Each structure stands twice: as C-alpha cells, then as structure tokens.
Amino acid sequence: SHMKKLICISLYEDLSMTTYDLSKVDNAELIGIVENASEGTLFVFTCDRPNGSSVIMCPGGGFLKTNLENEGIDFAEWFTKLGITYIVFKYRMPHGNPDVPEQDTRLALKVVREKFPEFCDKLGVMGASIGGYLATFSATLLPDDEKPDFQILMYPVVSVDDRLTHFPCRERMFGHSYSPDKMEQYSPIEHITSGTPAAFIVAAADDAVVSPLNGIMYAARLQKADIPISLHIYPAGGHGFGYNDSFVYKQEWLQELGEWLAKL
Structure with missing residues (x-):
C-alpha cells in the first residue's frame, strides 16, 4: 500500500480536521469514517511518494x-x-437549491489549494454519474483561475437540458x-471555453441511467x-461500474486512465 494518512476536512464546520494513520485503519473502520462524516x-488520502498532483x-x-x-x-x-x-468529496445534497453544486466545488477547490499547495502542482477533479456534473461544472462555469487543471468523467451528466x-x-x-x-446557466456542455481543462471520459454504451451521449457529445x-x-x-458494462471487478473492462479502462495521467 502506498497511502499514508487520511485527513478529513469538514468544509461547513469551521474546516475542522481529523487525521488517521491508514496503516492502523481497516476498510470497515474506513467505511464508518466516511459514512458518519x-x-x-x-477525505484526503496522502501518498508515500507524492508527485505533487491531486484529484478531487x-x-x-x-x-x-x-x-x-x-x-x-x-x-x-x-x-x-x-x-x-486522492480526495473524496462527500458533497452536499442540493435539496432544491441548484447553486449548491457550484458552491461546493468552488469551496472544495479553494480549500484544497489553500491547505495543500504541495499537492496542487496540478489539481484535477473527478466525477462519476451526477458527480460528473460537479466535475464538468468546475471545468466550465468556474472562473479560469479557479478551474481545475484536468477533469476525469465517468458516465457523467453534463447538462440539465431535456435532451441529455x-x-x-x-x-x-x-x-x-x-x-x-435556466438550461444554459446550468449546463456545463454549453460553457466549454479555451480555459476548459483536458478531459478523460469513460462510459458504457448500454448505460440505462444516463445517456452515453452526455460523455460523447461533451468530448465532441x-x-x-x-x-x-x-x-x-x-460496448457493455452499464452505469455506475466505479471500481467494481464485475466490470469486464475494468483493467482496460484503468490502464487507459493510468496512461492518460502519466502524459498530463
């Protein structure tokens, strides 16, 4: 294992922090920590040999x-x-306020840059499913100086338009x-600009939750x-494959992601 420490930062409770030694924490305790937060x-996972880059x-x-x-x-x-x-963002549920994703991503990026400059030579964001809406929002509708340096999207939602x-x-x-x-102001695919960062996009064609045209047309x-x-x-795999071994293409797409990260 190449992960050293877990640092938990509560964005909406005075940035209160708790730190764990990962060599002393098993997966069951780790699950409890993220669920109870x-x-x-x-949740910041630090490296034994960090290269100066981070992903949220x-x-x-x-x-x-x-x-x-x-x-x-x-x-x-x-x-x-x-x-x-590697930073997992337990973001807020919007509960009918559509500006909550913007508020969360801006604050998360700002805090990570402030607290961990040593890990922000390149700061990217990753998002799966509706999490990809937060990720693509951060890459398009934030100011250029706040945009992340790269974006990783897994079966993302990139629009609030009916079509996608x-x-x-x-x-x-x-x-x-x-x-x-309200479609344009809340659709990242409508706000691609010269400042928008390089993207890695992966999905399965049989996705029955979110049309893979989200990722395809965003990439286009x-x-x-x-x-x-x-x-x-x-061609197959469905929505929400995540890190599951049951995805028949798991090694293929992770190899793609690893090669992509190396060439950033």
Whole structure:
C-alpha cells in the first residue's frame, strides 16, 4: 500500500480536521469514517511518494447520497500508488437549491489549494454519474483561475437540458423551480471555453441511467474547442461500474486512465 494518512476536512464546520494513520485503519473502520462524516467533508488520502498532483473525486449517488465506496474510497489505493493525492468529496445534497453544486466545488477547490499547495502542482477533479456534473461544472462555469487543471468523467451528466439530463437528479437539484430558460446557466456542455481543462471520459454504451451521449457529445464539443480529450466508450458494462471487478473492462479502462495521467 502506498497511502499514508487520511485527513478529513469538514468544509461547513469551521474546516475542522481529523487525521488517521491508514496503516492502523481497516476498510470497515474506513467505511464508518466516511459514512458518519457530515455532508460537505473532504477525505484526503496522502501518498508515500507524492508527485505533487491531486484529484478531487465527486462520487455519484443521484443527489440522494454519495457512493463513497465504489465511486470513492475504492479508488484511493490506485491513485496513491501513482503518487497522486486522492480526495473524496462527500458533497452536499442540493435539496432544491441548484447553486449548491457550484458552491461546493468552488469551496472544495479553494480549500484544497489553500491547505495543500504541495499537492496542487496540478489539481484535477473527478466525477462519476451526477458527480460528473460537479466535475464538468468546475471545468466550465468556474472562473479560469479557479478551474481545475484536468477533469476525469465517468458516465457523467453534463447538462440539465431535456435532451441529455437525468430527470430525477434535475428535480432534486431544482425542486419545482426548473424552467427551460435556466438550461444554459446550468449546463456545463454549453460553457466549454479555451480555459476548459483536458478531459478523460469513460462510459458504457448500454448505460440505462444516463445517456452515453452526455460523455460523447461533451468530448465532441471539447475536441471542437481544441481541448485535448481521451474518450473511451465500451460496448457493455452499464452505469455506475466505479471500481467494481464485475466490470469486464475494468483493467482496460484503468490502464487507459493510468496512461492518460502519466502524459498530463
């Protein structure tokens, strides 16, 4: 194992911090820590040999909860092994306030940059499913000086437009307040600009939760804007494969991700 410490930062409780020695913590205790933590908490997994780069993962969970294992802590060993500091974001549920994702991503990026400059030579964000909405929002609708340096998207939602969005997530995000005039201000795919960072995008063509055209058309619009892309659509595997071994393409897509990270 190449992960040393776990530092938990409570963004909405005076940035209160707790630190654990990972060599003394097993997976069952680790699960309890992330489950018991309040919303708006960052879990920072530090490396034995850090290379100065960090990723903030925004898990999926349909704006009901966060998938803190399969789209969270289960990636920690994989990232820290490469010297990449790995941060799982237990973000807040919006509960009808659609500006909560923007508020959470801006604060998470700001705090990570402030507390860990040594790990922010490159600071990227990762997002799975509706977590990819937070990830792509951070890459498009934040100011250039706040945007992350790279973005990793797993079966992301990239729009609130009817054509692409996940309707239960949109309803949880807006309550009854969604209207089509709000589409542009809340759709990252509509805000790709020259500052938008290089992207890694992966999904399965048989995804029955979120149309894989989310990732495909996001990548297509990035490419048209001359933003470098690494795009991988597998024919099968469904939504939410995360780190599961049951995904028949697990080794293939992780090998793609590892090669991509090395060439950043």
